[PDB]
Design an enzyme around this catalytic site. Structure first.
Site, PDB file in Angstrom:
ATOM      1  N   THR A   1      16.248  22.401  52.899  1.00 53.56           N
ATOM      2  CA  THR A   1      16.187  22.932  54.255  1.00 53.56           C
ATOM      3  C   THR A   1      16.188  21.801  55.280  1.00 53.56           C
ATOM      4  O   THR A   1      15.743  20.694  54.987  1.00 53.56           O
ATOM      5  CB  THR A   1      14.921  23.799  54.406  1.00 53.56           C
ATOM      6  OG1 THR A   1      15.278  25.179  54.291  1.00 53.56           O
ATOM      7  CG2 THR A   1      14.221  23.563  55.737  1.00 53.56           C
ATOM      8  N   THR A   2      16.694  22.058  56.479  1.00 50.96           N
ATOM      9  CA  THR A   2      16.699  21.008  57.492  1.00 50.96           C
ATOM     10  C   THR A   2      15.431  21.041  58.354  1.00 50.96           C
ATOM     11  O   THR A   2      14.945  22.109  58.733  1.00 50.96           O
ATOM     12  CB  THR A   2      18.053  20.952  58.297  1.00 50.96           C
ATOM     13  OG1 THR A   2      17.854  20.329  59.575  1.00 50.96           O
ATOM     14  CG2 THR A   2      18.665  22.339  58.480  1.00 50.96           C
TER      15      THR A   2
END
Lengths: 235, 111, 237, 243, 197, 250, 233, 241, 242
Positions: free
Chosen positions: C24-25
């Site tokens: 995930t960012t």
């Protein structure tokens, strides 16, 4: 310390192989003494012979060993064998029976065979000793932790050639002087050198000490080997 | 010097009838000549139809009742919810107490 | 792991980075008296309880941590971070300075690249806060490498996020406010969702600003969260 | 995959591949550094490269203040650099407590070298991918530079350099002492010793420097300090009005 | 607790009190305060209540083990040195053995009887005759007089009879007679008829 | 954290060789040449100070080290491995000997100890043998002067003269010719200086040659007067100046 | 890319994957099906037990952890025992030391951290079991999904094990129905039972087949087996 | 501490290290045990690579454990010493705590126990040893014979053999040992033991040794002569058409 | 060849799977659970006529109310039995009652887990899994007569009937038909004998097969040779008529 499909101990076999390339050592047992002879591996003129020891070690006052293999690995085992002897003397106020000390060292070797993942010691021993239970005794131990008793035995280089010659000329009723003679003769013929000189030899005897009723250890001085090499017709 | 023990008084009483039992105690908790509390219960329902009181040094008594309550909890876990029989409790409490043979719970305990 | 490859690099650390890039960012933005943290929460299913699988973590009372990669590795790291903050406070009374806290995580991570019996961490952690002399933002890579940042990004959408951050840095050289960085973090997370968009996502923002939170770490909730989501939803259409 | 490539056991040629790769690692940051000795100071210079615009440039350093008197510059990846930095600080504090005087530059060098030697010998520890340059005005030896590498090697230097262009900087310095015929920079102020150091960095690298391309540490009697950009800028202005 | 030992010319004789007394009661009147260590070695012991048998039985186990391991019997001199070292270790440990012993053995290699006296501190000494505790305060002087180095076993048994008689006259406590045992070239036998002789 | 290699990294191969030991000797081969010569009133050990760039200070590197006031050591192979062996050797001379008998050990026994440290690295878990060979020269009251060689296996032997490293084979030959049992110390130094001229390429002077003697007692190198019952250490490092003086009359 | 990188857990693959962890996850697939769902007043576990033979037990798959908490397993059963045992101790500690019932969310974090350590230690293996965790605490009803990778997530409902995807699809759509089963235990259990069906090619679900557990507002964690689950078939 | 597992399972369900230990046993010199009506007899062979030994001091094959129990082995000698010592300690320790010598069953169960433990411990290999253990329970007269192998399995035997060419001597024993009528005497029990060894050894010279155990710690070793008297008798008697 | 507690891509532990193969190579053990008792029967399988058949202990007592039959590498069961007997006795000491059969089995299965290279367990003092499965049978007040199969995996299962060993596939299928919830003890004994006779390599007699049962009222008894020989002589006669 693992098993082969055949049921041998890989690292042990390879350690024995290592020993087969080391200078030859011989033990001969007389009715009134024990001889130790050993040959130094391809040396030089500049190598000090006077202050040198590499194949024959004093364990206590009544027991000595001939080393074939890794000099250093033997120093370790020698020193703990020296300690075991002193522990026994302290506990019992009696010198250690030759066998008991031999069993103890053989047990130490056996350990490196069964547990711990460390490499065995690349060392074989000939033990010459006297005690008042069994008289003169000659023993042998190798990396496998196995020990056997002998009338005459050899370890290291060319043991097949050496064993044959000893079987030929040995007999139960020998004197120490003939055993000394036999020891040199055998080494004369199993050497990888031109001839056999004094500076390539270590020599020790365990006699009944001339006149006393007491046991004597003699680690032959350089000059004394040179002498004993003359009388027996080798100069 | 430090004394790890104290005495909080109190008196407990247990009587066993034919098909019932009673465990009773006063609710007074004391130190020397002072009253710490007029209502401080020291008789406890421990589950599995067992009542317990550990009278004497109240700190030790509480530790013990705590550990037995918990002992009951884990009995249920480890032994498929089996009811802890009163005799099995008593034996378990022996072991609790003797665990501290050399630094005892300063209590007289009744179940 | 205790293995250099012939180019001087550490191939086990290098593979850890891959696991990070896969995550995930998440981002951090330093503002003129604080720091803001944001992360992309993938909604695998409608069954996830909204607002209830919190990814941002507090250390002590003044330090925020967010990470991308293997979540368990991140949590393990924060647990150590917390022991390391407790230990410093215990001995020195004052709460742990941020540069000091960065090196404590630093040295710990780096240790897991020294022995073949351990594996490196599969996370890049963005963390920071306000100490006795200002706001600080830090990012720590699986190798133990870390530096101070004006803005920071890691995870699947790291490039698009890094680009936005550079635009912010370049177009606001005077400074950026706490309120503003919050809105912008929401923008940047939406813009970053582009490179991981086969799924719906939940936003999460936290901050630590001298004036807006008295120098303590707080989550952004209620009005201020919805205001940020709105700001983002607006500048994506 | 032969084991002699992965752990620190000998290869048939009596070599240690991991140590060799650790040396390779020391160049990863593409930074060159050099150290020189003044009459009564010691100066270290290193390039500073801040590529990423998102970085806070003030937090990007490869120079470390180990004790009040000893400074250290590292060539190699930062995590390993910081590992060796924390340890050297620990070791320098411990020395002072146990022995009642400040750990000398050369002794700390030796101690760190021994530590590195251990990783060279033990299989579970990897070497550190770093070269450490230690500098000080020692209370007994004077201006001092001692340098350690992943092999466990350390020695003292009149001057030295480390990094990708190590060789060019060395011969450049070698050539200077060949002519000047002395084993130091005969200059009273540390400011002119820094100026010298930068000058010779420029000639050997064929590059011009602004204030943000460098990092300077100076070691004086009982203090080691690093320079701010503006200190460096004033140094850069002074070389400009002569060279 | 009477522990007596006498070395004659061809054998060693040990006499040991038969009473065991805890507090206000004599619990047993037939206690054998002795363990056989090997076919030709005997140990007698007195001291603190528990340690007494534990120590002897532990010494016994070790000697028996040695025997079987080498198919050989240790000399009295060697056995006693083992025992001494044990006590010498013990004296400086957390809770020392409080046990005094006499070791009587016949050395088959030498054809000599040997008597060793060792106390709880690990003090060993070889003696023509020995005792532990108060008993020696009466006997040593009696044996100083009547003892000869070349007595027969039968004569040593008359010397002990004199010792026990004296102890029964002048000792405050009723030690309920002694068990007497001979150690010679043939091993260990018990003269189980000494009490009413 | 924690050692996961608890097994020997040096094991026997089917032919009977111990691999890592051989390779350690191969490492010793590439090492710079070093030598020891035993005279009647001294011993000389010497080696080259192969400087890596003239910016390095040659004096700050110890290739010849005092182990005890009567014993010195020199090496060929890996410098770092040597440095730690010197420290362990100095410390063991104290802990195993001086702290027990109140006198420094005799040469053969210190050598025995170093050999032990080296043997152990031949057998312990998670380690490689030391990549050095040592020459240890010393004097002790009962054995007089001696010289020993210690190899990666932990094997040691005494020599009247020898050399190790790069130009060893050639130097052993040079020494064999020039050695007799009646050499004064100055003769042995001269022979050592000659033998070492074969190995060296470039500059050959006192600043590129490290050389130490085990000779007479040096009372002025003791540090204190008043106990006339030691005239000081027998170990002495020859100065750069002292070497050059014996080079002019070479 | 798949070869020498699945030796231990201490190894990353060039893709960035921990294969030993992934293979541990696989043990769950091969495990029997189990379902978890909650409203606002209650939380329910429905686990289909699996028999080895026609003559065998249908192995227990629901373990009680505290009076307010419990879990259902799919995968290596012994691993479910180690973890639930650890959970029992943690709930217990919270009670003795703090007189506080352990929050379901904290139980989640604690399982995550225990599982994580086995994904980083040499000579140890990851856990090989998935767990569904229901509880009622100070913030109401809760359901958690535990994965041996260390990943824990809080949900309204879910399913793990063989063909779990069927039950999970059903629950994804039945969402707004079952969540409103407040103060009606048996209707929530029914929704659980119907959820476990969408994952059965197998057969009908029989008396010994079925195992149900419930915990709610004034309902301590109870397991129902056989006789008392018949009214749900 | 090295605890890397050496004894592991293979796909077919075999522990190969245990397996290769048996190989070492089959490699070792032969040993036989046969039990009579009021005795048990043990017999061993000796190798022939060398013959300049000193037999006075060389470790005999039948070892004494306690005064009433003996143990013989086939396999690695160095290993057998370690088992024998441990068995000797346990023997004494049992006397010390139960006030009674070991039963033969118990001593067997203990040695088999030690052998098993070494099949499932990190950094250790199984014993390349398999044993026969024989004697009489204290105050009992019914003869006992047992066998242990590297796996830790143990059981009793009317007669049994281990080591090289044991296959053949077990072949012989299966034919000639009658369950209904055990060799009723010491003499006729030693005879069946000498016969069974002759198939494998060659000359019954310095290569065959025998040991006899009767009840109440009665253990006598035979000499070359008394053995030669059986060798001479059987070779001449059992030759005729 | 990689590790001792490693997962296959299928999600099984290699060593655990391979130990099960070792158990397949073991001698047959059969258990039948009724309402009058539980019967345990085993195949002795002497590898030679000279082996004294009654020194084959493959049925052991754990407590008065708990018995155990083994199969596989039987030497591995030594410490399991030791551990079980201790756990049962210890429980009586702490609680003045009998251990529940499930609890006793669960404790043995815990012991079976303790395998690993000094693993992140604590310590895991044991290198491999056990090469032996156990049928554990007994009675307690709560749950009555019970039979359990305990694998070296640490998993255990309750059965009405179960067969383990070489003849297990054929024996289990035969148990499927023959078992009903009204089998008498005597009926159950005969079934064990019958099914053993089918799958055994040798001809079934009293020397090479052992029977045992646990009743509430008499506890765990091993049937001696003479009493079993009668049940054989009663089976052959029962199956002569059919």
């Amino acid at each position: 310390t693992i098993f082969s499909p055949e049921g041998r101990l890989y690292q042990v076999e390879y350690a024995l192989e290592s020993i087969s390339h080391a200078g030859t050592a011989i033990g001969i047992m007389a009715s009134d003494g024990i001889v130790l002879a050993a040959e130094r591996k391809v040396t030089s003129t500049l190598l000090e012979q006077d202050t040198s020891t590499e194949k024959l070690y004093k364990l206590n006052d009544k027991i000595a060993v001939a080393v074939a293999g890794l000099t250093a690995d033997a120093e370790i085992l020698i020193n703990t064998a020296r300690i075991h002897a002193q522990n026994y003397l302290k506990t019992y106020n009696e010198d250690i029976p030759v066998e008991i000390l031999v069993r103890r060292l053989s047990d130490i070797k056996q350990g490196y065979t069964q547990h711990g993942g460390l490499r065995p010691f690349g060392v074989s021993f000939i033990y010459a000793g006297y005690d008042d239970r069994y008289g003169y005794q000659l023993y042998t131990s190798n990396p496998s932790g196995n020990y056997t008793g002998w009338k005459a035995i050899s370890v290291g280089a060319n043991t097949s050639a050496a064993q044959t010659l000893l079987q030929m000329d040995y007999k139960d009723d020998m004197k120490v002087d003939d055993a000394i003679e036999l020891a040199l003769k055998t080494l004369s013929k199993t050497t990888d050198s031109s001839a056999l000189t004094y500076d390539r030899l270590e020599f020790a005897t365990i006699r009944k000490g001339a006149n006393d009723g007491e046991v004597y250890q003699k680690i032959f001085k350089p000059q004394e080997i040179k002498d004993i090499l003359v009388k027996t017709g080798i100069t | 010097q430090f004394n790890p023990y104290g005495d909080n008084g109190g008196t407990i009483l247990g009587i066993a009838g034919e098909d019932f039992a009673v465990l009773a105690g006063d609710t007074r908790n004391i130190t020397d000549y002072s009253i710490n509390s007029r209502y401080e219960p020291k008789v406890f329902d421990c589950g599995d139809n067992i009542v317990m009181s550990a009278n004497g040094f109240a700190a030790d008594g509480d530790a013990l009742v705590k550990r037995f309550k918990n002992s009951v909890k884990w009995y249920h876990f480890d032994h498929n919810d089996k009811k802890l029989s009163i005799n099995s409790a008593a034996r378990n409490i022996q072991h609790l107490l003797y665990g501290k043979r050399f630094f005892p719970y300063y209590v007289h305990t009744i179940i | 792991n205790s293995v250099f490859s012939p180019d001087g690099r550490n191939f086990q650390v290098e593979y850890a980075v891959k696991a990070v890039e896969n995550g995930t960012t998440s981002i951090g933005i330093k503002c003129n008296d604080g720091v803001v943290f944001a992360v992309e929460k993938l909604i695998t299913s409608k069954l996830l309880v909204p607002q209830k699988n919190v990814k941002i973590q507090v250390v002590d009372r003044h330090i925020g941590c967010v990470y991308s990669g293997l979540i368990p590795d991140g949590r393990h790291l924060v647990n150590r971070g917390r022991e390391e903050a407790a230990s410093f406070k215990k001995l020195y009374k004052t709460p742990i300075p941020i540069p000091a806290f960065a090196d404590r995580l630093g040295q710990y991570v780096q240790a897991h690249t020294l022995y073949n019996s351990v594996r490196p961490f599969g996370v890049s952690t963005i963390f920071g806060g306000v100490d006795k002399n200002g706001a600080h933002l830090y990012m720590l890579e699986p190798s133990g490498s870390y530096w101070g940042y004006k803005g920071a990004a890691t995870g699947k959408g790291r490039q698009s996020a890094k680009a936005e951050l550079e635009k912010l840095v370049d177009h606001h050289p005077e400074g950026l406010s706490a309120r503003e960085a919050v809105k912008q973090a929401a923008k940047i997370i939406y813009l970053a969702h582009e490179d991981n968009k086969e799924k719906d996502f939940e936003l999460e923002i936290s901050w630590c600003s001298l004036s807006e939170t008295n120098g303590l770490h707080k989550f952004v909730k209620g009005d201020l969260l919805q205001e940020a989501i709105d700001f983002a939803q607006k500048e994506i259409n | 995959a032969g084991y002699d490539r992965h752990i620190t056991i000998f290869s048939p040629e009596g070599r240690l591949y991991q140590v060799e790769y650790a040396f390779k690692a020391t160049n990863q940051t593409n930074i060159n550094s050099l150290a020189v000795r003044g009459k009564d100071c010691t100066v270290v210079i290193s390039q500073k490269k801040v590529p990423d615009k998102l970085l806070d440039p003030t937090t990007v350093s490869y120079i470390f203040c180990i004790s009040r008197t000893i400074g250290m510059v590292v060539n190699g990846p930062i995590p390993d650099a910081r590992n060796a930095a924390l340890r050297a600080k620990a070791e320098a504090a411990e020395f002072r407590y146990k022995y009642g005087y400040d750990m000398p530059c050369d002794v700390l060098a030796k101690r760190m070298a021994n530590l590195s030697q251990i990783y060279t010998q033990r299989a579970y520890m990897r070497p550190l991918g770093v070269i450490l340059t230690f500098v000080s005005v020692d209370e007994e030896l004077g201006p001092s530079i001692y340098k350690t590498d992943p092999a466990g090697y350390y020695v003292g230097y009149k001057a030295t350099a480390t990094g990708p262009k190590q060789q060019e900087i060395t011969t450049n310095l070698e050539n200077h002492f060949k002519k000047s015929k002395i084993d130091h920079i005969n200059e009273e102020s540390w400011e002119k010793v820094v100026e010298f150091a930068i000058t010779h960095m420029i000639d050997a690298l064929g590059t011009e420097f602004s204030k943000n391309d460098l990092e300077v540490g100076v070691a004086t009697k009982d203090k080691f300090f690093t320079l701010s950009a503006e200190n460096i800028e004033e140094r850069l202005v002074a070389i400009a009005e002569q060279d | 607790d009477i522990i007596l030992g006498i070395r004659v010319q061809d054998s060693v004789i040990l006499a040991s009190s038969k009473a065991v007394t805890r507090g206000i009661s004599v619990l047993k009147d037939s206690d054998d305060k002795t363990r056989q260590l090997s076919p030709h070695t005997l140990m007698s012991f007195a001291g603190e209540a528990g340690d007494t048998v534990q120590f002897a039985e532990y010494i016994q186990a070790n000697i028996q083990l040695y025997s079987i391991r080498e198919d050989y019997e240790l000399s009295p001199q060697a056995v006693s040195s083992f025992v001494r070292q044990e006590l010498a270790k013990s004296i400086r440990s957390r809770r020392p053995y409080q046990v005094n012993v006499l070791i009587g053995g016949y050395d088959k290699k030498k054809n000599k009887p040997e008597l060793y006296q060792i106390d709880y501190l690990g003090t060993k000494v070889e003696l023509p005759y020995g005792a532990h505790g108060y008993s020696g305060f009466y006997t040593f002087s009696l044996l100083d007089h009547h003892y000869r180095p070349d007595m027969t076993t039968e004569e040593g048994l008359d010397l002990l009879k004199l010792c026990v008689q004296e102890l029964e006259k002048r000792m405050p406590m009723d030690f309920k007679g002694v068990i007497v045992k001979i150690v010679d070239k043939d091993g260990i036998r018990q003269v189980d008829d000494f009490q009413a002789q | 954290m924690t050692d996961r290699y608890s097994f020997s990294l040096t094991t026997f191969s089917p032919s009977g060789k111990l691999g890592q030991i051989d390779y350690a000797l191969t490492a010793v081969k590439q090492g710079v040449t070093s030598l020891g010569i035993k005279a009647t009133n001294g011993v000389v050990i010497a080696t080259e100070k192969k400087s890596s760039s003239p910016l390095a200070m040659s004096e700050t590197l110890s290739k010849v080290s005092l182990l005890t006031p009567d014993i010195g050591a020199v090496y060929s192979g890996m410098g770092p491995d040597y440095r730690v062996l010197v420290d362990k050797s100095r410390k063991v001379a104290h802990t195993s000997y001086k702290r027990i008998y109140g006198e420094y050990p005799p040469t053969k026994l210190l050598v025995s100890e170093v050999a032990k440290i080296m043997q152990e690295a031949t057998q312990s878990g998670g380690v490689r043998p030391f990549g050095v060979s040592l020459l240890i020269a010393g004097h002790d009251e009962f054995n007089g002067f001696s010289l020993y060689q210690v190899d990666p296996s932990g094997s040691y032997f005494p020599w009247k003269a020898t050399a190790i490293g790069k130009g060893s084979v050639a130097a052993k030959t040079f020494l064999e010719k020039r050695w007799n049992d009646e050499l004064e110390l100055e003769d042995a130094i001269h022979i050592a200086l000659l033998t070492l001229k074969e190995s060296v390429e470039g500059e050959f002077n006192g600043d590129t040659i490290e050389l130490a003697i085990i000779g007479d007692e040096n009372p002025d190198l003791l540090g204190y007067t008043g106990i006339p019952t030691d005239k000081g250490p027998r170990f002495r490092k020859l100065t750069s100046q002292e070497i050059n003086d014996r080079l002019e009359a070479l | 890319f798949r070869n020498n990188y699945d030796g231990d857990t201490v190894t990353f693959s060039p893709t960035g994957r921990l294969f030993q962890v992934e293979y541990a996850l696989e043990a769950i697939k091969q495990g029997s099906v189990t379902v978890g769902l909650r409203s606002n007043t209650h939380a329910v576990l429905v686990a289909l037990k699996r028999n080895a033979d026609e003559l065998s037990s249908y192995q227990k798959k629901i373990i009680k952890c505290d009076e307010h908490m419990g879990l259902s397993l799919a995968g290596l059963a012994p691993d479910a025992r180690v973890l639930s045992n650890y959970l029992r101790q943690q709930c217990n500690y919270s009670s003795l030391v703090f007189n506080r019932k352990l929050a379901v969310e904290r139980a989640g974090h604690l399982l995550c951290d225990k599982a994580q350590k086995n994904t980083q230690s040499y000579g140890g293996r990851p856990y090989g079991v998935g767990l569904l965790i229901i509880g009622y605490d100070k913030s109401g009803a809760h359901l958690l999904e535990f994965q041996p990778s260390g990943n824990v997530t809080e949900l309204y409902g879910t399913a793990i094990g063989a063909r779990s995807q069927g039950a999970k699809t059903y629950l994804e759509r039945t969402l707004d129905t079952f969540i409103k089963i407040d103060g009606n235990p048996d209707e929530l259990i029914k929704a659980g039972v119907e959820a476990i069906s969408q994952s059965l090619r197998d057969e009908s679900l029989t008396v010994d087949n079925l195992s149900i557990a419930i915990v709610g507002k004034d309902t301590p964690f109870t397991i129902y087996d056989g006789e008392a689950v018949a009214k749900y078939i | 501490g090295y605890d890397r597992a050496l004894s592991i399972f293979s796909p077919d369900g075999h522990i190969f290290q245990v397996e290769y230990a048996l190989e070492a046993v089959k490699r070792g010199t032969c040993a036989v045990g046969v039990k009579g009506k009021n005795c048990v007899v043990l017999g061993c062979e000796r190798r022939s690579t060398l013959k300049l030994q000193d037999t006075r001091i060389t470790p005999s094959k039948v070892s004494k454990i306690d005064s009433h129990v003996v143990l013989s082995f086939s396999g690695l000698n160095a290993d057998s010493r370690i088992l024998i010592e441990k068995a000797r300690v346990e023997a004494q320790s049992h006397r010390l705590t139960l006030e009674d010598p070991v039963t033969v069953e118990y001593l067997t169960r203990y040695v088999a126990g030690v052998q098993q433990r070494y099949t499932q411990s990190g950094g250790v290999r199984p014993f390349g040893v398999s044993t026969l253990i024989a004697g009489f329970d204290p105050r009992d007269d019914e003869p006992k014979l047992y066998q242990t192998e590297p796996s830790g399995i143990y059981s009793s035997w009317s007669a049994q053999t281990i080591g090289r060419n044991s296959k053949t001597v077990r072949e012989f024993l299966e034919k000639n040992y009658d369950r209904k009528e055990p060799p009723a005497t010491v003499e006729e029990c030693v005879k069946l033991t000498v016969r069974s060894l002759l198939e494998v050894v060659q000359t019954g010279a310095k290569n065959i040794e025998i040991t006899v155990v009767k009840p109440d710690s009665d253990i006598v070793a035979l000499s070359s002569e008394e053995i030669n008297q059986y060798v001479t008798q059987i070779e001449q008697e059992k030759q005729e058409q | 060849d990689r590790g001792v507690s490693t997962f296959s891509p299928e999600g099984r532990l290699f060593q655990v799977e391979y130990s099960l193969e070792a158990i397949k190579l073991g001698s047959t053990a059969i258990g039948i659970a009724t309402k009058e008792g539980v019967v345990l029967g085993v195949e002795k399988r002497a590898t030679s006529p000279l082996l004294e058949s009654d020194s084959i202990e493959k049925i052991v007592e754990i407590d008065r109310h708990i018995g155990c039959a083994m199969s596989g590498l039987t030497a591995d069961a030594r410490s399991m039995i030791e551990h079980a007997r201790t756990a049962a006795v210890t429980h009586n000491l702490y609680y003045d009652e009998d251990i529940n059969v499930e609890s006793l089995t669960q404790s043995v299965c815990d012991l079976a887990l303790r395998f690993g290279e000094g693993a992140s367990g604590e310590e895991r003092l044991m290198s491999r899994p056990f090469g032996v499965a156990l049928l554990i049978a007994g009675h307690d007040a709560d749950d009555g007569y019970q039979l359990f199969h305990a694998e070296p995996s640490g998993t255990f299962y309750r059965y009405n009937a179960k067969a383990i060993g070489s003849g297990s596939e054929g024996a289990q299928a035969e148990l499927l038909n023959e078992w009903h919830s009204s089998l008498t003890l005597k009926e159950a004994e005969l079934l064990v004998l019958k099914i053993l006779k089918q799958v055994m390599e040798e001809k079934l007699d009293e020397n090479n097969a052992q029977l045992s049962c646990i009743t509430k009222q008499d506890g765990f008894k091993i049937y001696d040779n003479e009493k079993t020989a009668e049940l054989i002589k009663e089976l052959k006669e029962k199956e002569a008529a059919e």
